[PDB]
Design a protein around this nucleic acid. Structure first.
Ligand SMILES: [K+]
Ligand SMILES: [K+]
Lengths: 223, 213
RNA sequence: GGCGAUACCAGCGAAACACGCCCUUGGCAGCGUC
């Protein structure tokens, strides 16, 4: 029933600007406080701003006061976060959250959106190179084989990696990306399969990097 | 600003254990304190509001209490699905503030890694770079030493590691170590090896390959 | 323990502020004083 859907995120330069939207469904925002909360990758939740019902009063974290503006349009049932003078430290997933009804859950934030990723960086977009990680053993060895794909030199996050168009999920490990000294990301995705399936079963890694409009399928065969 | 000082920053607990997470507000916040659960890759969910009230639908093993400006979240008996990062938050005054979080992971028995090594692809080598990948699969605990040796020489400063989040069903981890070298550097040596030390192994395990061979 | 003057928390309206209603009672806590 209750849904919050953030949008508007993307990659921008330091000093740039971006406007996020949070579309509410299943309730009317005019009777609720609405909050923005952000989360840098692998870091904690950070409260950003909020707007109060009836008054429209607004509040901001010290770290964004003067640069960000929260607003709402009750006729669109949507809330907004205009972000200006952006800096690298603003990079984060931005969540929209509803503060619940006072008599039901106090001031707890009872519904959260899925968030929208904002990346602030001077680095240019670049799609990945995809290379096979050839099966670790022979088809006739009787045990388990590991195989995978190296997804190297891309920016910004995220890429998605599937195997056999999503049909292969069991035993898949797609590792968190790490930044190389070049400032570009790299990761590997691996899977373990029965050695006896090599040959019979075809293994393809499907890599999608929407920020660069890049899609790659790479077959991974025995060497 | 009111600081929320949350402790510990991480903990590894067994299923069935009682887990206590604490948050001290730097000045009075009355009872305007909420607790959230956030699983990796997911949005936070509300557990407790107004310091001690259970949010509707939340299991009763979760409870909160207040002693002055000290706020405690207790899980009376940790369940397997309870791994997550937990956050306290004050709503007494603006700006609202979150604690730094407590990452709760599941303790399990020791498990040694299965080790695999991958030479660089011929397609990569033509581009002038060689990535060699070592995979440590399904082990516990997370701590591990991975050491690269090229023709028996210890390598340093040319490799990076990545570790997965704890597996939801086997509570293990996996890790990748990638050694990067130039094509010329790669082609000046023959034996590439990855030596793994882990407390589940009685002695280090080496996987290697011989270049070209 | 008494007395005195206070300082803050609070009911409801879809509601932290603002706006409307209700209320003159409760509650911790310090201070002053015997
Ligand atoms: K509300
Ligand atoms: K404003």
């Amino acid at each position: 029933e209750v849904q919050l859907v953030e949008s508007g995120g993307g990659l921008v330069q330091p000093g740039g600007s971006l406007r996020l939207s949070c579309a509410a469904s299943g309730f009317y925002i005019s009777y609720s406080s609405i909050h923005w909360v952000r989360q840098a990758p692998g870091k904690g939740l950070e409260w950003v701003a909020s707007i109060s019902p009836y008054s429209g009063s607004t509040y901001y974290a010290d770290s964004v006061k003067g640069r960000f503006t929260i607003s709402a349009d009750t006729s669109k049932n949507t809330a907004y976060l205009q972000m200006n003078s952006l800096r690298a430290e603003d990079t984060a997933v931005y969540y929209c959250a509803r503060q619940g009804y006072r008599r039901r859950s106090g001031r707890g934030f009872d519904y959260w959106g899925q968030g929208t990723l904002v990346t602030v960086s001077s680095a240019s977009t670049k799609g990945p190179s995809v290379f096979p990680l050839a099966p670790s053993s022979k088809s006739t060895s009787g045990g388990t084989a590991a195989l995978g794909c190296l997804v190297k030199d891309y920016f910004p996050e995220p890429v998605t990696v599937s195997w056999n168009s999503g049909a292969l999920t069991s035993g898949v490990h797609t590792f968190p990306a790490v930044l190389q000294s070049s400032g570009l990301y790299s990761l590997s995705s691996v899977v373990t399969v029965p050695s006896s399936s090599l040959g019979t079963q075809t293994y393809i890694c499907n890599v999608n990097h929407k920020p660069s409009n890049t899609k790659v399928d790479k077959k991974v065969e025995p060497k | 600003d009111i600081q929320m000082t949350q402790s510990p920053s991480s903990l590894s607990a067994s299923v069935g254990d009682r887990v206590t997470i604490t948050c001290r507000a730097s000045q009075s916040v009355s009872s305007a304190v909420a607790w959230y659960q956030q699983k990796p890759g997911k949005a936070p969910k509300l557990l407790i509001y107004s310091a001690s009230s259970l949010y509707s639908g939340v299991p009763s093993r979760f409870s909160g209490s207040r002693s002055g400006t000290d706020f405690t979240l207790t899980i009376s008996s940790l369940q397997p699905e309870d791994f997550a990062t937990y956050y306290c938050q004050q709503s007494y005054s603006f700006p609202n503030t979150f604690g730094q979080g407590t990452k709760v992971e599941i303790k399990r028995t020791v498990a040694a890694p299965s080790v695999f090594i991958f030479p660089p692809s011929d397609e990569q080598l033509k581009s002038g770079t060689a990535s060699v990948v070592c995979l440590l699969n399904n082990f516990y605990p997370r701590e591990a030493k991975v050491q690269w040796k090229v023709d028996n020489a210890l390598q340093s400063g040319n490799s990076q590691e990545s570790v997965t989040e704890q597996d939801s069903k086997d509570s293990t981890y996996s890790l990748s170590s990638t050694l990067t070298l130039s094509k010329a550097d790669y082609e000046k040596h023959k034996v590439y090896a990855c030596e793994v030390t882990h407390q589940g192994l009685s002695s280090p395990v080496t996987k290697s390959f011989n270049r070209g061979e």
